[PDB]
Protein backbone atom coordinates (compact mmCIF):
# COMPACT_ATOMS: atom_id res chain seq x y z
CA UNK A 1 0.00 0.00 0.00
CA UNK A 2 2.11 2.85 -1.34
CA UNK A 3 1.59 6.24 0.37
CA UNK A 4 -1.59 7.76 -1.08
CA UNK A 5 0.05 11.14 -1.64
CA UNK A 6 2.23 9.61 -4.39
CA UNK A 7 -0.47 8.49 -6.83
CA UNK A 8 -2.45 11.53 -5.74
CA UNK A 9 0.51 13.71 -6.77
CA UNK A 10 0.51 12.27 -10.31
CA UNK A 11 -3.28 12.61 -10.65
CA UNK A 12 -3.28 16.17 -9.31
CA UNK A 13 -0.36 17.30 -11.48
CA UNK A 14 -1.99 15.89 -14.60
CA UNK A 15 -5.30 17.55 -13.68
CA UNK A 16 -3.57 20.91 -13.22
CA UNK A 17 -1.80 20.57 -16.58
CA UNK A 18 -5.14 19.85 -18.26
CA UNK A 19 -6.79 22.81 -16.51
CA UNK A 20 -4.09 25.20 -17.74
CA UNK A 21 -4.45 24.02 -21.33
CA UNK A 22 -8.25 23.98 -21.21
CA UNK A 23 -8.28 27.59 -20.04
CA UNK A 24 -5.66 28.88 -22.51
CA UNK A 25 -7.08 27.19 -25.58
CA UNK A 26 -10.68 28.09 -24.95
CA UNK A 27 -9.93 31.68 -23.94
CA UNK A 28 -8.24 31.87 -27.37
CA UNK A 29 -11.44 30.59 -29.00
CA UNK A 30 -13.57 33.23 -27.28
CA UNK A 31 -11.02 35.95 -28.06
CA UNK A 32 -11.08 35.05 -31.78
CA UNK A 33 -14.88 35.21 -32.04
CA UNK A 34 -14.98 38.52 -30.17
CA UNK A 35 -12.31 40.06 -32.41
CA UNK A 36 -13.21 38.75 -35.90
CA UNK A 37 -16.58 39.70 -37.39
CA UNK A 38 -16.15 36.91 -39.96
CA UNK A 39 -16.49 34.52 -36.99
CA UNK A 40 -19.59 36.20 -35.50
CA UNK A 41 -22.48 33.97 -36.61
CA UNK A 42 -25.00 31.84 -34.72
CA UNK A 43 -22.99 28.63 -35.13
CA UNK A 44 -20.05 30.22 -33.35
CA UNK A 45 -22.15 31.60 -30.51
CA UNK A 46 -22.76 27.96 -29.59
CA UNK A 47 -19.04 27.35 -30.10
CA UNK A 48 -18.40 30.10 -27.54
CA UNK A 49 -20.93 28.61 -25.11
CA UNK A 50 -19.07 25.30 -25.46
CA UNK A 51 -15.71 27.03 -24.91
CA UNK A 52 -17.15 28.76 -21.83
CA UNK A 53 -18.09 25.36 -20.41
CA UNK A 54 -14.55 24.14 -21.06
CA UNK A 55 -13.03 27.23 -19.42
CA UNK A 56 -15.12 26.42 -16.35
CA UNK A 57 -13.88 22.81 -16.42
CA UNK A 58 -10.40 24.27 -15.93
CA UNK A 59 -11.33 26.96 -13.40
CA UNK A 60 -13.89 25.04 -11.32
CA UNK A 61 -14.53 21.41 -12.25
CA UNK A 62 -10.88 20.36 -12.12
CA UNK A 63 -10.24 22.02 -8.71
CA UNK A 64 -13.46 20.35 -7.50
CA UNK A 65 -12.30 16.95 -8.85
CA UNK A 66 -8.96 17.33 -7.08
CA UNK A 67 -10.81 18.23 -3.88
CA UNK A 68 -13.21 15.28 -4.00
CA UNK A 69 -10.39 12.83 -4.72
CA UNK A 70 -9.14 13.49 -1.18
CA UNK A 71 -12.27 12.24 0.56
CA UNK A 72 -12.15 15.28 2.85
CA UNK A 73 -14.76 15.80 5.56
CA UNK A 74 -17.69 17.87 4.31
CA UNK A 75 -21.32 18.63 4.89
CA UNK A 76 -22.98 16.15 2.58
CA UNK A 77 -24.87 18.68 0.45
CA UNK A 78 -21.76 20.81 -0.08
CA UNK A 79 -19.95 17.65 -1.16
CA UNK A 80 -22.82 16.99 -3.58
CA UNK A 81 -22.34 20.40 -5.17
CA UNK A 82 -18.59 19.78 -5.63
CA UNK A 83 -19.33 16.36 -7.09
CA UNK A 84 -22.14 17.43 -9.43
CA UNK A 85 -21.04 20.78 -10.84
CA UNK A 86 -19.09 19.04 -13.64
CA UNK A 87 -22.38 17.39 -14.71
CA UNK A 88 -23.75 20.88 -15.35
CA UNK A 89 -20.82 21.68 -17.64
CA UNK A 90 -21.07 18.36 -19.48
CA UNK A 91 -24.80 18.89 -19.94
CA UNK A 92 -24.28 22.40 -21.27
CA UNK A 93 -21.71 20.97 -23.69
CA UNK A 94 -24.25 18.43 -24.94
CA UNK A 95 -26.86 21.15 -25.51
CA UNK A 96 -24.31 23.25 -27.41
CA UNK A 97 -23.25 20.28 -29.56
CA UNK A 98 -26.85 19.43 -30.38
CA UNK A 99 -27.57 23.06 -31.29
CA UNK A 100 -24.54 23.20 -33.57
CA UNK A 101 -25.75 20.07 -35.39
CA UNK A 102 -29.26 21.43 -35.77
CA UNK A 103 -27.95 24.81 -36.96
CA UNK A 104 -25.92 23.11 -39.69
CA UNK A 105 -28.95 21.02 -40.71
CA UNK A 106 -31.12 24.12 -41.15
CA UNK A 107 -28.37 25.76 -43.21
CA UNK A 108 -28.04 22.79 -45.58
CA UNK A 109 -31.71 21.80 -45.79
CA UNK A 110 -33.47 25.16 -46.03
CA UNK A 111 -30.77 27.74 -46.86
CA UNK A 112 -33.36 30.20 -48.22
CA UNK A 113 -34.94 30.70 -44.79
CA UNK A 114 -31.93 30.07 -42.53
CA UNK A 115 -31.00 33.73 -41.98
CA UNK A 116 -34.59 34.65 -41.12
CA UNK A 117 -35.10 31.64 -38.85
CA UNK A 118 -31.76 31.43 -37.03
CA UNK A 119 -30.86 34.83 -35.55
CA UNK A 120 -28.31 35.95 -32.99
CA UNK A 121 -30.99 37.10 -30.55
CA UNK A 122 -32.79 33.76 -30.75
CA UNK A 123 -29.49 31.90 -30.35
CA UNK A 124 -28.65 33.91 -27.23
CA UNK A 125 -32.01 33.04 -25.69
CA UNK A 126 -31.54 29.35 -26.48
CA UNK A 127 -28.07 29.41 -24.88
CA UNK A 128 -29.51 31.01 -21.73
CA UNK A 129 -32.28 28.40 -21.60
CA UNK A 130 -29.81 25.59 -22.13
CA UNK A 131 -27.57 26.80 -19.28
CA UNK A 132 -30.55 26.92 -16.89
CA UNK A 133 -31.62 23.42 -17.93
CA UNK A 134 -28.02 22.21 -17.50
CA UNK A 135 -27.99 23.41 -13.88
CA UNK A 136 -31.33 21.69 -13.27
CA UNK A 137 -30.14 18.39 -14.80
CA UNK A 138 -26.63 18.38 -13.34
CA UNK A 139 -27.73 19.43 -9.86
CA UNK A 140 -30.79 17.16 -9.69
CA UNK A 141 -29.05 15.17 -6.87
CA UNK A 142 -29.18 18.35 -4.74
CA UNK A 143 -32.99 18.18 -5.03
CA UNK A 144 -32.98 14.96 -3.02
CA UNK A 145 -31.82 12.20 -5.35
CA UNK A 146 -28.71 11.58 -3.28
CA UNK A 147 -27.23 9.29 -0.62
CA UNK A 148 -26.98 11.97 2.08
CA UNK A 149 -29.77 10.30 4.04
CA UNK A 150 -27.64 7.14 4.40
CA UNK A 151 -24.11 8.36 5.19
CA UNK A 152 -21.25 5.89 5.51
CA UNK A 153 -20.83 6.50 9.23
CA UNK A 154 -17.90 4.12 9.68
CA UNK A 155 -15.93 5.91 6.97
CA UNK A 156 -16.83 9.31 8.44
CA UNK A 157 -15.71 8.28 11.92
CA UNK A 158 -12.46 6.79 10.64
CA UNK A 159 -11.62 10.15 9.03
CA UNK A 160 -12.48 12.07 12.20
CA UNK A 161 -15.36 13.86 10.45
CA UNK A 162 -17.69 16.00 12.53
CA UNK A 163 -21.39 15.58 13.06
CA UNK A 164 -23.43 15.98 9.91
CA UNK A 165 -20.29 15.49 7.80
CA UNK A 166 -19.31 12.66 5.46
CA UNK A 167 -16.11 11.67 3.74
CA UNK A 168 -16.64 13.51 0.46
CA UNK A 169 -16.31 10.75 -2.16
CA UNK A 170 -18.20 10.78 -5.46
CA UNK A 171 -19.72 7.30 -5.34
CA UNK A 172 -20.70 7.65 -1.69
CA UNK A 173 -22.92 10.71 -2.26
CA UNK A 174 -24.08 10.58 -5.92
CA UNK A 175 -26.53 7.68 -6.57
CA UNK A 176 -25.43 5.35 -9.33
CA UNK A 177 -29.02 4.90 -10.57
CA UNK A 178 -29.00 8.65 -11.14
CA UNK A 179 -25.63 8.43 -12.91
CA UNK A 180 -26.67 5.55 -15.21
CA UNK A 181 -30.38 6.00 -16.01
CA UNK A 182 -30.84 9.74 -15.68
CA UNK A 183 -27.47 11.27 -16.41
CA UNK A 184 -26.06 8.76 -18.90
CA UNK A 185 -28.98 7.12 -20.67
CA UNK A 186 -31.48 10.00 -20.69
CA UNK A 187 -29.32 13.13 -20.64
CA UNK A 188 -26.17 12.06 -22.54
CA UNK A 189 -26.75 8.96 -24.67
CA UNK A 190 -30.13 9.98 -26.11
CA UNK A 191 -28.88 13.47 -27.16
CA UNK A 192 -25.70 11.99 -28.66
CA UNK A 193 -27.82 9.52 -30.65
CA UNK A 194 -30.06 12.42 -31.74
CA UNK A 195 -26.92 14.28 -32.85
CA UNK A 196 -25.86 11.24 -34.87
CA UNK A 197 -29.27 11.23 -36.57
CA UNK A 198 -28.98 14.94 -37.37
CA UNK A 199 -25.50 14.47 -38.85
CA UNK A 200 -26.75 11.54 -40.95
CA UNK A 201 -29.53 13.79 -42.27
CA UNK A 202 -27.05 16.61 -43.04
CA UNK A 203 -24.73 14.37 -45.05
CA UNK A 204 -27.64 12.68 -46.84
CA UNK A 205 -29.07 16.10 -47.71
CA UNK A 206 -25.67 17.25 -49.00
CA UNK A 207 -25.30 14.07 -51.07
CA UNK A 208 -28.75 14.54 -52.61
CA UNK A 209 -28.22 18.20 -53.47
CA UNK A 210 -24.91 17.54 -55.22
CA UNK A 211 -26.54 14.71 -57.19
CA UNK A 212 -29.36 17.08 -58.15
CA UNK A 213 -26.80 19.61 -59.44
CA UNK A 214 -25.05 16.99 -61.56
CA UNK A 215 -28.37 15.59 -62.80
CA UNK A 216 -29.49 19.02 -63.99
CA UNK A 217 -26.11 19.55 -65.67
CA UNK A 218 -26.39 16.20 -67.48
CA UNK A 219 -30.02 16.85 -68.43
CA UNK A 220 -28.94 20.13 -70.02
CA UNK A 221 -26.19 18.55 -72.11
CA UNK A 222 -28.17 15.41 -73.00
CA UNK A 223 -31.14 17.37 -74.31
CA UNK A 224 -28.84 19.62 -76.36
CA UNK A 225 -27.57 16.47 -78.08
CA UNK A 226 -31.16 15.32 -78.66
CA UNK A 227 -31.95 18.61 -80.41
CA UNK A 228 -28.85 18.41 -82.61
CA UNK A 229 -29.76 14.97 -83.97
CA UNK A 230 -33.52 15.46 -84.02
CA UNK A 231 -35.18 14.99 -87.40
CA UNK A 232 -38.51 16.79 -86.88
CA UNK A 233 -39.78 19.85 -85.06
CA UNK A 234 -41.71 17.81 -82.49
CA UNK A 235 -38.51 16.17 -81.24
CA UNK A 236 -36.86 19.58 -80.87
CA UNK A 237 -39.93 20.80 -78.97
CA UNK A 238 -39.91 17.83 -76.59
CA UNK A 239 -36.28 18.35 -75.57
CA UNK A 240 -36.65 22.13 -75.22
CA UNK A 241 -39.63 21.81 -72.88
CA UNK A 242 -37.60 19.50 -70.63
CA UNK A 243 -34.70 21.97 -70.80
CA UNK A 244 -36.93 24.90 -69.88
CA UNK A 245 -38.40 23.23 -66.79
CA UNK A 246 -34.88 22.19 -65.77
CA UNK A 247 -33.49 25.70 -66.27
CA UNK A 248 -36.09 27.16 -63.91
CA UNK A 249 -35.38 24.29 -61.52
CA UNK A 250 -31.69 25.24 -61.44
CA UNK A 251 -32.66 28.90 -60.98
CA UNK A 252 -34.50 28.13 -57.72
CA UNK A 253 -26.71 37.06 -58.13
CA UNK A 254 -27.19 39.67 -60.86
CA UNK A 255 -24.80 37.91 -63.24
CA UNK A 256 -26.38 34.68 -62.00
CA UNK A 257 -29.84 36.00 -62.86
CA UNK A 258 -28.65 37.40 -66.20
CA UNK A 259 -27.18 34.04 -67.22
CA UNK A 260 -30.43 32.21 -66.55
CA UNK A 261 -32.44 35.02 -68.18
CA UNK A 262 -30.47 34.52 -71.39
CA UNK A 263 -30.84 30.75 -71.06
CA UNK A 264 -34.62 30.73 -70.58
CA UNK A 265 -35.05 33.36 -73.30
CA UNK A 266 -32.94 31.36 -75.75
CA UNK A 267 -35.01 28.27 -74.95
CA UNK A 268 -38.19 30.27 -75.63
CA UNK A 269 -36.74 31.57 -78.91
CA UNK A 270 -36.04 28.01 -80.08
CA UNK A 271 -39.39 26.70 -78.79
CA UNK A 272 -41.23 29.32 -80.83
CA UNK A 273 -39.35 28.26 -83.97
CA UNK A 274 -40.06 24.60 -83.19
CA UNK A 275 -43.80 25.31 -82.84
CA UNK A 276 -43.71 27.02 -86.26
CA UNK A 277 -42.22 23.84 -87.74
CA UNK A 278 -38.86 25.50 -88.47
CA UNK A 279 -36.60 22.64 -87.38
CA UNK A 280 -33.24 23.76 -88.83
CA UNK A 281 -33.82 27.29 -87.54
CA UNK A 282 -34.78 25.88 -84.13
CA UNK A 283 -31.66 23.70 -83.96
CA UNK A 284 -29.49 26.71 -84.85
CA UNK A 285 -31.23 28.76 -82.15
CA UNK A 286 -30.56 25.93 -79.71
CA UNK A 287 -26.85 25.91 -80.55
CA UNK A 288 -26.70 29.40 -79.03
CA UNK A 289 -27.50 27.75 -75.69
CA UNK A 290 -23.94 26.37 -75.61
CA UNK A 291 -22.40 29.84 -75.45
CA UNK A 292 -24.65 30.65 -72.49
CA UNK A 293 -23.89 27.29 -70.87
CA UNK A 294 -20.14 27.86 -71.15
CA UNK A 295 -20.06 31.54 -70.17
CA UNK A 296 -22.64 31.41 -67.35
CA UNK A 297 -24.32 28.13 -66.37
CA UNK A 298 -21.16 26.11 -65.76
CA UNK A 299 -19.82 28.84 -63.46
CA UNK A 300 -23.00 28.66 -61.37
CA UNK A 301 -22.78 24.85 -61.25
CA UNK A 302 -19.17 24.99 -60.05
CA UNK A 303 -19.90 27.68 -57.45
CA UNK A 304 -22.95 25.80 -56.13
CA UNK A 305 -20.87 22.62 -55.86
CA UNK A 306 -18.13 24.56 -54.07
CA UNK A 307 -20.60 25.96 -51.53
CA UNK A 308 -22.02 22.50 -50.79
CA UNK A 309 -18.54 21.03 -50.41
CA UNK A 310 -17.66 23.73 -47.87
CA UNK A 311 -20.86 22.98 -45.95
CA UNK A 312 -19.99 19.27 -45.93
CA UNK A 313 -16.50 20.17 -44.72
CA UNK A 314 -17.86 22.37 -41.93
CA UNK A 315 -20.40 19.74 -40.87
CA UNK A 316 -17.60 17.16 -40.71
CA UNK A 317 -15.60 19.45 -38.44
CA UNK A 318 -18.58 19.88 -36.10
CA UNK A 319 -19.23 16.11 -36.11
CA UNK A 320 -15.60 15.44 -35.17
CA UNK A 321 -16.01 17.60 -32.07
CA UNK A 322 -19.25 15.85 -31.12
CA UNK A 323 -17.58 12.48 -31.69
CA UNK A 324 -14.57 13.46 -29.57
CA UNK A 325 -16.91 14.47 -26.76
CA UNK A 326 -18.45 10.98 -26.91
CA UNK A 327 -15.02 9.30 -27.09
CA UNK A 328 -13.71 11.18 -24.05
CA UNK A 329 -16.78 10.79 -21.81
CA UNK A 330 -18.02 7.30 -22.71
CA UNK A 331 -15.35 5.37 -20.74
CA UNK A 332 -16.39 6.95 -17.45
CA UNK A 333 -20.09 6.35 -18.20
CA UNK A 334 -19.40 2.74 -19.25
CA UNK A 335 -17.45 2.12 -16.03
CA UNK A 336 -20.44 3.48 -14.08
CA UNK A 337 -22.59 0.98 -15.96
CA UNK A 338 -20.33 -1.89 -14.83
CA UNK A 339 -20.39 -0.67 -11.22
CA UNK A 340 -24.18 -0.39 -11.28
CA UNK A 341 -25.31 -3.37 -13.38
CA UNK A 342 -22.63 -5.87 -12.27
CA UNK A 343 -22.42 -5.82 -8.45
CA UNK A 344 -20.81 -9.29 -8.68
CA UNK A 345 -17.97 -7.75 -10.72
CA UNK A 346 -15.01 -6.31 -8.86
CA UNK A 347 -15.09 -2.50 -8.97
CA UNK A 348 -12.96 -0.94 -11.69
CA UNK A 349 -9.59 -0.24 -10.03
CA UNK A 350 -8.74 3.20 -8.73
CA UNK A 351 -6.04 3.87 -11.35
CA UNK A 352 -8.62 3.25 -14.09
CA UNK A 353 -11.22 5.47 -12.44
CA UNK A 354 -8.73 8.32 -12.42
CA UNK A 355 -7.57 7.62 -15.99
CA UNK A 356 -11.21 7.85 -17.12
CA UNK A 357 -11.71 11.10 -15.20
CA UNK A 358 -8.55 12.61 -16.70
CA UNK A 359 -9.70 11.48 -20.16
CA UNK A 360 -13.07 13.19 -19.71
CA UNK A 361 -11.32 16.41 -18.65
CA UNK A 362 -8.97 16.23 -21.65
CA UNK A 363 -12.00 16.82 -23.87
CA UNK A 364 -11.91 20.43 -22.69
CA UNK A 365 -8.47 20.80 -24.33
CA UNK A 366 -9.16 19.39 -27.77
CA UNK A 367 -11.70 21.67 -29.50
CA UNK A 368 -9.33 24.68 -30.01
CA UNK A 369 -7.03 22.30 -31.93
CA UNK A 370 -9.85 21.02 -34.14
CA UNK A 371 -10.82 24.59 -35.03
CA UNK A 372 -7.20 25.52 -35.72
CA UNK A 373 -6.54 22.55 -37.99
CA UNK A 374 -9.90 22.54 -39.80
CA UNK A 375 -11.22 26.13 -40.01
CA UNK A 376 -9.01 28.70 -41.79
CA UNK A 377 -10.83 31.69 -40.32
CA UNK A 378 -10.08 30.45 -36.80
CA UNK A 379 -6.51 29.43 -37.61
CA UNK A 380 -5.76 32.83 -39.16
CA UNK A 381 -7.30 34.75 -36.27
CA UNK A 382 -5.38 32.62 -33.73
CA UNK A 383 -2.22 33.50 -35.66
CA UNK A 384 -3.00 37.23 -35.47
CA UNK A 385 -3.77 37.07 -31.73
CA UNK A 386 -0.58 35.15 -30.94
CA UNK A 387 1.68 37.23 -33.20
CA UNK A 388 0.28 40.53 -31.95
Ligand SMILES: CC(C)CCC[C@@H](C)[C@H]1CC[C@H]2[C@@H]3CC=C4C[C@@H](O)CC[C@]4(C)[C@H]3CC[C@]12C
Pocket residue numbers: 073074075077078079081082
Ligand atom coordinates in the same frame (compact mmCIF):
# COMPACT_ATOMS: atom_id res chain seq x y z
C1 LIG B 1 -18.30 32.18 -8.67
C2 LIG B 1 -17.21 31.22 -8.19
C3 LIG B 1 -15.85 31.81 -8.52
C4 LIG B 1 -17.34 30.94 -6.69
C5 LIG B 1 -16.85 29.54 -6.31
C6 LIG B 1 -17.51 29.13 -4.99
C7 LIG B 1 -17.25 27.66 -4.60
C8 LIG B 1 -15.72 27.45 -4.57
C9 LIG B 1 -17.94 27.34 -3.27
C10 LIG B 1 -19.47 27.52 -3.36
C11 LIG B 1 -20.13 26.58 -2.34
C12 LIG B 1 -18.91 25.98 -1.61
C13 LIG B 1 -19.13 24.67 -0.91
C14 LIG B 1 -20.36 24.83 0.00
C15 LIG B 1 -20.33 23.90 1.20
C16 LIG B 1 -19.29 23.10 1.51
C17 LIG B 1 -19.46 22.15 2.67
C18 LIG B 1 -18.26 22.24 3.63
O1 LIG B 1 -18.41 21.26 4.68
C19 LIG B 1 -16.95 22.05 2.91
C20 LIG B 1 -16.79 23.07 1.74
C21 LIG B 1 -17.96 23.10 0.76
C22 LIG B 1 -17.88 21.82 -0.15
C23 LIG B 1 -17.88 24.36 -0.09
C24 LIG B 1 -16.65 24.36 -1.01
C25 LIG B 1 -16.56 25.61 -1.89
C26 LIG B 1 -17.80 25.95 -2.66
C27 LIG B 1 -18.06 24.89 -3.79
Ligand SMILES: CC(C)CCC[C@@H](C)[C@H]1CC[C@H]2[C@@H]3CC=C4C[C@@H](O)CC[C@]4(C)[C@H]3CC[C@]12C
Pocket residue numbers: 075077078079081
Ligand atom coordinates in the same frame (compact mmCIF):
# COMPACT_ATOMS: atom_id res chain seq x y z
C1 LIG C 1 -24.44 32.26 -11.71
C2 LIG C 1 -25.32 31.32 -10.88
C3 LIG C 1 -25.05 29.88 -11.30
C4 LIG C 1 -25.13 31.54 -9.37
C5 LIG C 1 -24.15 30.56 -8.71
C6 LIG C 1 -24.38 30.47 -7.19
C7 LIG C 1 -24.15 29.06 -6.59
C8 LIG C 1 -22.92 28.42 -7.25
C9 LIG C 1 -24.02 29.07 -5.05
C10 LIG C 1 -24.87 30.17 -4.42
C11 LIG C 1 -25.26 29.73 -3.02
C12 LIG C 1 -24.54 28.40 -2.84
C13 LIG C 1 -25.10 27.46 -1.80
C14 LIG C 1 -25.19 28.18 -0.46
C15 LIG C 1 -25.31 27.20 0.70
C16 LIG C 1 -25.21 25.86 0.59
C17 LIG C 1 -25.55 25.02 1.79
C18 LIG C 1 -24.58 23.85 2.02
O1 LIG C 1 -25.15 22.94 2.98
C19 LIG C 1 -24.29 23.11 0.74
C20 LIG C 1 -23.81 24.05 -0.38
C21 LIG C 1 -24.80 25.18 -0.70
C22 LIG C 1 -26.06 24.53 -1.32
C23 LIG C 1 -24.21 26.21 -1.67
C24 LIG C 1 -23.88 25.63 -3.05
C25 LIG C 1 -23.47 26.68 -4.10
C26 LIG C 1 -24.43 27.83 -4.24
C27 LIG C 1 -25.78 27.31 -4.81
Ligand SMILES: CC(C)CCC[C@@H](C)[C@H]1CC[C@H]2[C@@H]3CC=C4C[C@@H](O)CC[C@]4(C)[C@H]3CC[C@]12C
Pocket residue numbers: 326327330331332334335338345346347348349352
Ligand atom coordinates in the same frame (compact mmCIF):
# COMPACT_ATOMS: atom_id res chain seq x y z
C1 LIG D 1 -15.58 4.48 -25.56
C2 LIG D 1 -14.59 3.45 -26.09
C3 LIG D 1 -13.20 4.06 -26.08
C4 LIG D 1 -14.68 2.13 -25.30
C5 LIG D 1 -14.16 2.19 -23.86
C6 LIG D 1 -14.38 0.83 -23.18
C7 LIG D 1 -13.80 0.70 -21.75
C8 LIG D 1 -14.33 1.85 -20.88
C9 LIG D 1 -14.15 -0.69 -21.17
C10 LIG D 1 -13.53 -1.82 -22.00
C11 LIG D 1 -13.21 -2.98 -21.07
C12 LIG D 1 -13.93 -2.59 -19.78
C13 LIG D 1 -13.54 -3.35 -18.52
C14 LIG D 1 -13.76 -4.85 -18.71
C15 LIG D 1 -13.80 -5.58 -17.38
C16 LIG D 1 -13.84 -4.96 -16.17
C17 LIG D 1 -13.72 -5.79 -14.92
C18 LIG D 1 -14.85 -5.47 -13.93
O1 LIG D 1 -14.59 -6.18 -12.71
C19 LIG D 1 -14.96 -3.99 -13.66
C20 LIG D 1 -15.08 -3.16 -14.95
C21 LIG D 1 -13.99 -3.47 -16.00
C22 LIG D 1 -12.62 -2.88 -15.53
C23 LIG D 1 -14.39 -2.85 -17.34
C24 LIG D 1 -14.43 -1.32 -17.25
C25 LIG D 1 -14.70 -0.64 -18.60
C26 LIG D 1 -13.78 -1.07 -19.73
C27 LIG D 1 -12.32 -0.63 -19.44
Ligand SMILES: CC(C)CCC[C@@H](C)[C@H]1CC[C@H]2[C@@H]3CC=C4C[C@@H](O)CC[C@]4(C)[C@H]3CC[C@]12C
Pocket residue numbers: 189330334337338341342
Ligand atom coordinates in the same frame (compact mmCIF):
# COMPACT_ATOMS: atom_id res chain seq x y z
C1 LIG E 1 -23.06 3.33 -28.80
C2 LIG E 1 -22.68 2.78 -27.43
C3 LIG E 1 -21.25 3.17 -27.05
C4 LIG E 1 -23.66 3.25 -26.36
C5 LIG E 1 -23.24 2.83 -24.95
C6 LIG E 1 -23.26 1.30 -24.80
C7 LIG E 1 -23.30 0.87 -23.31
C8 LIG E 1 -24.60 1.37 -22.67
C9 LIG E 1 -23.07 -0.64 -23.17
C10 LIG E 1 -21.75 -1.09 -23.81
C11 LIG E 1 -21.22 -2.30 -23.03
C12 LIG E 1 -22.37 -2.62 -22.08
C13 LIG E 1 -22.02 -3.44 -20.85
C14 LIG E 1 -21.38 -4.77 -21.28
C15 LIG E 1 -21.30 -5.74 -20.10
C16 LIG E 1 -21.99 -5.59 -18.95
C17 LIG E 1 -21.81 -6.61 -17.85
C18 LIG E 1 -23.16 -7.14 -17.36
O1 LIG E 1 -22.92 -7.98 -16.23
C19 LIG E 1 -24.04 -5.99 -16.95
C20 LIG E 1 -24.24 -4.99 -18.09
C21 LIG E 1 -22.93 -4.44 -18.68
C22 LIG E 1 -22.28 -3.49 -17.62
C23 LIG E 1 -23.25 -3.68 -19.98
C24 LIG E 1 -24.01 -2.37 -19.72
C25 LIG E 1 -24.22 -1.53 -20.97
C26 LIG E 1 -22.96 -1.25 -21.76
C27 LIG E 1 -21.98 -0.37 -20.91
Ligand SMILES: CCCCCCCC/C=C\CCCCCCCC(=O)OC[C@H](O)CO
Pocket residue numbers: 059060063064067072073074
Ligand atom coordinates in the same frame (compact mmCIF):
# COMPACT_ATOMS: atom_id res chain seq x y z
C1 LIG F 1 -13.78 33.07 -11.74
C2 LIG F 1 -12.43 32.67 -11.13
C3 LIG F 1 -12.51 32.56 -9.62
C4 LIG F 1 -11.77 31.34 -9.08
C5 LIG F 1 -12.76 30.26 -8.65
C6 LIG F 1 -12.45 29.61 -7.31
C7 LIG F 1 -11.43 28.48 -7.42
C8 LIG F 1 -11.90 27.26 -6.64
C9 LIG F 1 -10.70 26.58 -5.99
C10 LIG F 1 -10.89 25.47 -5.31
C11 LIG F 1 -12.30 24.91 -5.20
C12 LIG F 1 -12.30 23.76 -4.22
C13 LIG F 1 -12.48 24.31 -2.82
C14 LIG F 1 -13.01 23.30 -1.82
C15 LIG F 1 -12.04 23.14 -0.67
C16 LIG F 1 -12.68 22.45 0.53
C17 LIG F 1 -11.64 21.95 1.52
C18 LIG F 1 -12.11 22.08 2.96
O1 LIG F 1 -13.08 22.71 3.20
O2 LIG F 1 -11.41 21.43 3.98
C19 LIG F 1 -12.00 21.54 5.24
C20 LIG F 1 -12.90 20.33 5.41
O3 LIG F 1 -13.72 20.55 6.53
C21 LIG F 1 -12.12 19.03 5.61
O4 LIG F 1 -11.76 18.89 6.96
Ligand SMILES: Nc1nc(NCCc2ccc(O)cc2)nc2nc(-c3ccco3)nn12
Pocket residue numbers: 086087169170171179332333336350353354357
Ligand atom coordinates in the same frame (compact mmCIF):
# COMPACT_ATOMS: atom_id res chain seq x y z
N1 LIG G 1 -17.88 6.94 -10.61
C1 LIG G 1 -17.25 8.12 -10.53
N2 LIG G 1 -16.32 8.27 -9.55
C2 LIG G 1 -15.65 9.45 -9.42
N3 LIG G 1 -14.73 9.59 -8.44
C3 LIG G 1 -14.47 8.50 -7.51
C4 LIG G 1 -13.53 7.40 -8.07
C5 LIG G 1 -13.65 6.32 -7.00
C6 LIG G 1 -14.52 5.24 -7.15
C7 LIG G 1 -14.61 4.26 -6.16
C8 LIG G 1 -13.82 4.38 -4.99
O1 LIG G 1 -13.89 3.44 -4.00
C9 LIG G 1 -12.95 5.47 -4.82
C10 LIG G 1 -12.86 6.44 -5.83
N4 LIG G 1 -15.88 10.50 -10.27
C11 LIG G 1 -16.81 10.31 -11.22
N5 LIG G 1 -17.22 11.20 -12.15
C12 LIG G 1 -18.14 10.47 -12.81
C13 LIG G 1 -18.88 10.96 -13.97
C14 LIG G 1 -19.03 12.28 -14.35
C15 LIG G 1 -19.83 12.13 -15.50
C16 LIG G 1 -20.08 10.78 -15.71
O2 LIG G 1 -19.48 10.01 -14.73
N6 LIG G 1 -18.36 9.19 -12.40
N7 LIG G 1 -17.47 9.15 -11.36
Ligand SMILES: CCCCCCCC/C=C\CCCCCCCC(=O)O
Pocket residue numbers: 058059063064066067070071072073
Ligand atom coordinates in the same frame (compact mmCIF):
# COMPACT_ATOMS: atom_id res chain seq x y z
C1 LIG H 1 -7.77 31.17 -12.13
C2 LIG H 1 -8.40 30.61 -10.85
C3 LIG H 1 -8.35 29.08 -10.81
C4 LIG H 1 -8.53 28.48 -9.40
C5 LIG H 1 -7.25 27.83 -8.84
C6 LIG H 1 -7.53 26.65 -7.89
C7 LIG H 1 -6.32 25.71 -7.70
C8 LIG H 1 -6.39 24.86 -6.42
C9 LIG H 1 -6.64 23.40 -6.73
C10 LIG H 1 -7.24 22.52 -5.90
C11 LIG H 1 -7.78 22.78 -4.50
C12 LIG H 1 -7.74 21.48 -3.71
C13 LIG H 1 -8.09 21.61 -2.24
C14 LIG H 1 -7.78 20.33 -1.47
C15 LIG H 1 -8.91 19.85 -0.57
C16 LIG H 1 -8.50 19.71 0.89
C17 LIG H 1 -7.78 18.40 1.21
C18 LIG H 1 -8.14 17.93 2.61
O1 LIG H 1 -8.64 18.73 3.40
O2 LIG H 1 -7.94 16.74 3.00
Ligand SMILES: CCCCCCCC/C=C\CCCCCCCC(=O)O
Pocket residue numbers: 129133136137
Ligand atom coordinates in the same frame (compact mmCIF):
# COMPACT_ATOMS: atom_id res chain seq x y z
C1 LIG I 1 -34.83 19.00 -14.83
C2 LIG I 1 -36.10 18.99 -15.69
C3 LIG I 1 -36.30 20.29 -16.48
C4 LIG I 1 -37.67 20.98 -16.26
C5 LIG I 1 -38.45 21.20 -17.57
C6 LIG I 1 -39.60 22.22 -17.49
C7 LIG I 1 -39.12 23.68 -17.29
C8 LIG I 1 -38.59 24.38 -18.56
C9 LIG I 1 -39.63 24.44 -19.66
C10 LIG I 1 -39.56 25.18 -20.79
C11 LIG I 1 -38.46 26.13 -21.25
C12 LIG I 1 -38.92 26.83 -22.51
C13 LIG I 1 -38.41 28.26 -22.70
C14 LIG I 1 -39.52 29.28 -22.89
C15 LIG I 1 -39.13 30.73 -22.64
C16 LIG I 1 -40.06 31.77 -23.28
C17 LIG I 1 -39.83 31.97 -24.78
C18 LIG I 1 -40.32 33.31 -25.31
O1 LIG I 1 -40.69 34.21 -24.53
O2 LIG I 1 -40.38 33.56 -26.55
Ligand code: NA
Pocket residue numbers: 050053054089090093363364
Ligand atom coordinates in the same frame (compact mmCIF):
# COMPACT_ATOMS: atom_id res chain seq x y z
NA1 NA J 1 -17.12 20.30 -22.85
